[PDB]
Symmetry: D2
Subunit: 218 residues, 4 copies
């Protein structure tokens, strides 16, 4: 016995640990992080989400099964009109000018992380893409679950909304869909295939750490 | 002067001509086509639409511009939940068993046409994909505009709905978006690039004829 | 092994009838017993030339999708072969006939030509490296058997003109090349589900159908 | 031409500062005047070996995206070169040092390694063949200038160990290879909009940034 999604989670434990206790993330949980830094983040994360949707697009093209191919398409819609909760909230809450947005550059860390998901999806099958997009969602879910106790973490007039977002029932459903998808796609892969998937999954986990890092370096 | 979308249309005129006057299509316009044949068609067209959505997915990944990348994503949603007007109407109007559907095989003509759009999109830029998906929509629009006068073509208890569908204001908006997209993407391409686009556009036009053909061969 | 189903053998099984129709096609028969008119064969090798360009691209996809240097390298060689081994077969016949260097890159592929190469491309691009191994196999394997079969008429090989073609696709090099492809596919798939094998089989018969259609249009020349 | 902006020249302009930082990097300087310790260089050519495998894949993408046999064929040769010209440079140093055949395919690429190759891949796959021509250019061009510069110390070339490396990337072959890439890019782009050129420039500087980061991590060895 061993489900692949649990096995991957197991090997990512340490890294998500560092993420939860990163100055930037702890900064979100106890209101200590300064707006300047968070502003820089949500602009970068916006650029990041545009490239992330493309990996989901890749899922549409590589799914051979209308159910899954359709699930991915909804994912793309969510990424574009659910930030129409989180990211948009903060672009007008801070004041990100419509122009300033599409004037921004992704940082090397940003681009590296999205290129890597994209490239691994393109070189492999639909298992790789299900694997490559998993860290991102899952990690944010644990992170927000964790920050959920301070308390007043949720009460916070500004950072409260972000935490509320990534710990909601929808976000969790979404992560669950991705967990289940990956398990169903893989109950038949060899020891060697699972290794490769595991390698993708930690690698994207590393990029998450690097991302928070460059976000704080702001 | 010459807009590329008009120039492409120009060279496709003859072929769409043959399409409008094809026994299968005329059969739709004057109620003469037998259900058996149409049944076989909507099952094939269903398979075809699944592969077609993937080309739109390709558009998401190849668009570098949030506006267009988002327009493509809506296209994918339409293809999947607008057949939840046309195709679904006829699957329960005829009686296509849920199983029978995903049991069906595409025919060589079907696969050839979708592989070709896919392959040309993948080998080129976002101009090729905007070009590769255009025949399909545009041609159906002219075809339904044409069948729109018989009359009683629209009145027909069975075939009326299909004609109504592809001549509606939404479908036309949709075709227009695709026309405009292509023109804006190309006002800067060389004589040689336009040639290539033209070649894609007639080639897909040919596949449309072949498609009606195999549909009638039913 | 060997009490265990081999996918290549299973694929081959399901293509049997189609390859039969191919061996006994007017055009192929015509090659085996000198009866086919040069006009038709000219048209053919012009089309086959275009076809071979797009076919290289699928092997190129093999390089990008192979994660393993040995296979990644075997694919690269395959691309080189396709480019400079027609520098046996295709070139032989372009100067043997007289295909002007211009005339070549002036030619259009036919719907059948495009359809076939589009399909291998799209299936490779949508899938993993198993799909590409499966998508390029019909073409090599079937020419192998066809040439093996035409190999007895005899005087099939003796023929001053069509002899070289048959000689080509029955050589030990082409043979080894087809075997590499068979083995590659078997090593990549010894762990795939019933459903995955089905999909690969469906790719194999489809490209087999395109081969028959290809000869057809070559004869329709 | 030639009162008309050349994109390759414009790209080169914007990479100037970065390539400067590269030439004067501890690691590169270390090569130019024998001071760099073998441990670090060993680590490097192991990483560079992994890197070169993924780099071939981008040229492979060039084959599939080139629509023109000449360029499609030039890319194929580039892949062959990358595989059997390290059969000068990389192989030299694997036996010169002693890299066990196993040790090789046992190595992991580093985040910096992966990031760089992922980026060239993804940008090539998302774009047309102009993007691939642009994505693989930094790497060749910058090593060219670096080797040209290290070419004077002298005794830089004389050095019994590091000499061969410098000799390699300043040869007339590597030179011709970089020129092919420059010319290809200019022919593909003489019709592109301001906005398209910007995107290509952004690809060029980005891969230039990855080069610097690459040397960095090689020295961090």
């Amino acid at each position: 016995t061993m489900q692949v999604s649990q096995y991957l989670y197991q090997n990512a434990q340490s890294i998500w640990g560092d993420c939860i206790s990163h100055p930037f993330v702890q900064g979100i949980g106890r209101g200590t992080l300064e707006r300047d830094k968070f502003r820089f983040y949500i602009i970068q994360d916006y650029l990041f989400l545009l490239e992330y949707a493309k990996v989901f697009a890749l899922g549409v093209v590589k799914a051979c099964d209308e159910a899954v191919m359709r699930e991915f398409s909804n994912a793309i819609q969510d990424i574009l009109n659910n930030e129409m909760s989180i990211h948009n909230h903060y672009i007008r809450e801070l004041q990100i000018t419509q122009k300033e947005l599409q004037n921004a550059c992704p940082t090397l860390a940003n681009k590296s992380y999205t290129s890597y998901m994209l490239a691994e999806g393109f070189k492999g099958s639909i298992k790789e893409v299900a694997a490559a997009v998993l860290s991102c969602g899952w990690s944010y879910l644990v992170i927000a679950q964790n920050l959920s106790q301070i308390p007043n973490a949720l009460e916070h007039a500004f950072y409260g909304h972000w935490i509320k977002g990534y710990s909601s029932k929808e976000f969790q459903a979404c992560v669950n869909w991705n967990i289940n998808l990956l398990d169903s796609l893989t109950l038949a892969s060899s020891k060697q295939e699972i290794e490769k998937l595991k390698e993708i999954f930690i690698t994207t986990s590393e990029y998450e750490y690097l991302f928070w890092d460059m976000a704080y370096q702001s």
